[PDB]
Design a protein around this motif. Structure first.
Motif, PDB file in Angstrom:
ATOM      1  N   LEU A 364       0.792  -1.238   0.000  1.00  0.00           N
ATOM      2  CA  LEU A 364       0.000   0.000   0.000  1.00  0.00           C
ATOM      3  C   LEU A 364       0.808   1.263   0.000  1.00  0.00           C
ATOM      4  N   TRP A 365       0.497   2.131  -0.950  1.00  0.00           N
ATOM      5  CA  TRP A 365       1.189   3.412  -1.102  1.00  0.00           C
ATOM      6  C   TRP A 365       0.158   4.543  -0.976  1.00  0.00           C
ATOM      7  N   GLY A 366       0.280   5.342   0.075  1.00  0.00           N
ATOM      8  CA  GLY A 366      -0.727   6.423   0.133  1.00  0.00           C
ATOM      9  C   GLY A 366      -0.379   7.500  -0.878  1.00  0.00           C
ATOM     10  N   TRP A 388       2.387  -4.492   3.422  1.00  0.00           N
ATOM     11  CA  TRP A 388       3.412  -3.502   3.603  1.00  0.00           C
ATOM     12  C   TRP A 388       2.816  -2.121   3.277  1.00  0.00           C
ATOM     13  N   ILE A 389       3.022  -1.167   4.149  1.00  0.00           N
ATOM     14  CA  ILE A 389       2.611   0.248   3.950  1.00  0.00           C
ATOM     15  C   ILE A 389       4.007   0.865   3.626  1.00  0.00           C
ATOM     16  N   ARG A 390       4.206   1.211   2.371  1.00  0.00           N
ATOM     17  CA  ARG A 390       5.482   1.723   1.899  1.00  0.00           C
ATOM     18  C   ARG A 390       5.789   3.194   2.073  1.00  0.00           C
ATOM     19  N   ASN A 435      16.479   0.523  10.392  1.00  0.00           N
ATOM     20  CA  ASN A 435      15.966   0.254   9.037  1.00  0.00           C
ATOM     21  C   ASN A 435      14.713   1.027   8.701  1.00  0.00           C
ATOM     22  N   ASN A 436      14.237   1.922   9.553  1.00  0.00           N
ATOM     23  CA  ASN A 436      13.022   2.706   9.239  1.00  0.00           C
ATOM     24  C   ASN A 436      11.787   1.835   9.044  1.00  0.00           C
ATOM     25  N   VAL A 437      11.622   0.834   9.900  1.00  0.00           N
ATOM     26  CA  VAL A 437      10.436  -0.033   9.774  1.00  0.00           C
ATOM     27  C   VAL A 437       9.738  -0.170  11.124  1.00  0.00           C
ATOM     28  N   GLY A 458       8.502   3.650   7.824  1.00  0.00           N
ATOM     29  CA  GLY A 458       8.345   4.945   8.493  1.00  0.00           C
ATOM     30  C   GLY A 458       8.008   4.736   9.959  1.00  0.00           C
ATOM     31  N   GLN A 459       7.977   5.847  10.650  1.00  0.00           N
ATOM     32  CA  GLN A 459       7.652   5.892  12.067  1.00  0.00           C
ATOM     33  C   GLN A 459       6.119   6.140  12.139  1.00  0.00           C
TER      34      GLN A 459
END
Ligand SMILES: [Ca+2]
Ligand SMILES: [Ca+2]
Ligand SMILES: [Ca+2]
Ligand SMILES: [Ca+2]
Ligand SMILES: [Ca+2]
Ligand SMILES: [Ca+2]
Ligand SMILES: [Ca+2]
Ligand SMILES: [Zn+2]
Length: 468
Positions: A364-366, A388-390, A435-437, A458-459
């Protein structure tokens, strides 16, 4: 909530069951298909269903002063533009069912013929009729009339079908009859002053079938003054019933809408202004509904037999029974994108979008804007096949889990904890700064281990990013 918008789209145009709409009975896709083919006439014989067919068609060179079987005269051969468009219409039918069309010589015998008429009696031009055709096995004086199609060339849409979409729609519609389809109703009611009021089932509208004469607005659609060029949802059920489904069509990775590789005028668009109206038939591959070029607020549903609101139109895009479309790209408006049980790549684009992956491992890409990612079942993102929310943006995007407390009728079902204890409803956020996850794990079922896990790039701020 994000969930409400999803819920609404999933129940858009529900049918069959014991539903009644304009006070009329609702028919399922399958029921409508059978009803449209109620005469049971096919090129393979009476009541011979599901077999492929091979047909020839031509553009006879008719004499002006000649009279046809219906009594019209002032006859003429299809022009180049008419021929071009009729060929596109035939192909639209050949794409969905096992029908092969071959063009033969003006001179030779053909199964399907196209001709123009202009007078209802010698020396008298007719400005009131549009077109007519005969269903297979129409026997008149020991002569089969089946396959003959005629159009009033005094009508500009008939004369210029490449610029008047009603004209292209007419071609497809008449050919439909030449294949064995009927209007979805007899409307024999009262007299010969038919109205939508006269239909047998509610879905008898141009929203569902181009065999219909009633406005798509009767069922809540809005084609913005346009006319569909190719078979619609119920038309596909009808023709596949007669000749079988075409399993060879678009079996590779297909893109519909913008940046289309279909080679179909009706499945492609090159600008915000060119509106699409279609029922998608696809036999295999990883496919995409690319509506990135539209500025209006759209609603895209990738489930089978469902309707989408695309390019500013309402319920103008649908998916045939048995087709799996995998990816969807929204535009710059505020969209609602609902996936299906397969793995989907869903991209919101600019605007404030609502994305719902459904089952499978979705990506998913917002995009830009304030987006909402909705979940309503542990199976939406099971460990082993996580979504996965990318591109999640903390303090901006949201994760909607509202469905669970709503169903539990409890404000404390879903609740955030620092460690799992095995209690049902426990939710945990694990952030990896290297890793920003961020891992979102939820124990919905209440088992020894969480049954729901979403991976987010992302956070995420627990204080502001959730809808519970
Ligand atoms: Ca395909
Ligand atoms: Ca597919
Ligand atoms: Ca968007
Ligand atoms: Ca967005
Ligand atoms: Ca999915
Ligand atoms: Ca965003
Ligand atoms: Ca999923
Ligand atoms: Zn008709």
């Amino acid at each position: 909530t994000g969930y409400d918008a999803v819920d609404d789209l999933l129940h858009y145009h529900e049918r069959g069951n014991g539903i009644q709409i304009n006070g009329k009975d609702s028919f399922s896709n399958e029921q409508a298909g059978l009803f449209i083919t109620r005469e049971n006439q096919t090129w393979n014989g009476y009541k011979v269903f599901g077999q492929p067919v091979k047909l020839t068609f031509s553009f006879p060179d008719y004499k002006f002063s000649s009279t046809n079987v219906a009594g019209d005269t002032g006859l003429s051969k299809f022009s180049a533009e008419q021929q071009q468009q009729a060929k596109l219409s035939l192909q639209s039918w050949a794409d969905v069912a096992n029908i092969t069309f071959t063009e033969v010589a003006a001179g030779q015998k053909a199964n399907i013929t196209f001709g123009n008429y202009s007078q209802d009696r010698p020396g008298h031009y007719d400005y009131g009729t549009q077109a007519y055709a005969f269903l297979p096995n129409t026997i008149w004086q020991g002569q089969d009339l089946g396959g003959q199609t005629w159009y009033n060339v005094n009508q500009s849409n008939v004369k210029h079908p490449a610029t008047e979409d009603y004209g292209r729609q007419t071609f497809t519609h008449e050919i439909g009859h030449a294949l064995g389809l009927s209007h979805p109703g007899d409307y024999n009611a009262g007299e010969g002053n038919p109205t939508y009021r006269d239909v047998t089932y509610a879905e008898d509208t141009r929203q569902f079938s181009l065999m219909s004469y009633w406005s798509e607005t009767n069922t809540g659609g809005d084609n913005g003054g346009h006319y569909a060029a190719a078979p619609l949802l119920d038309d596909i059920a009808a023709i596949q019933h007669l000749y079988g489904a075409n399993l060879s069509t678009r079996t590779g990775d297909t893109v519909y809408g913008f940046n289309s590789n279909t080679g179909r005028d009706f499945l492609s668009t090159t600008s915000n202004s060119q509106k699409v109206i279609f029922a998608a038939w696809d036999a295999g591959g990883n496919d995409t509904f690319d509506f990135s070029g539209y500025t209006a607020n759209q609603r895209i549903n990738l489930n089978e037999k469902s309707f989408s609101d695309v390019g500013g139109l309402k319920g103008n895009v649908s998916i045939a029974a048995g087709v799996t479309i995998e990816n969807a790209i929204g535009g710059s408006g505020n969209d609602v994108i609902v996936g299906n049980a397969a793995n989907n790549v869903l991209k919101g684009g600019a605007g404030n979008d609502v994305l719902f992956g459904g089952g499978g491992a979705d990506e998913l890409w917002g995009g830009a804007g304030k987006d909402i990612f909705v979940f309503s079942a542990a199976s939406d993102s099971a460990p082993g096949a996580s979504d996965w929310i990318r591109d999640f943006q903390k303090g901006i995007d949201k994760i909607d889990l509202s469905f669970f407390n709503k169903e539990a009728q409890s404000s404390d079902f879903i609740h955030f904890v620092d460690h799992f204890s095995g209690a049902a409803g426990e939710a945990l956020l694990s952030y990896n700064a290297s890793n920003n996850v961020t891992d979102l794990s939820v124990n919905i079922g209440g088992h020894q281990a969480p049954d729901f896990l979403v991976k987010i790039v992302g956070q995420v701020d627990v204080a502001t990013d959730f809808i519970v």
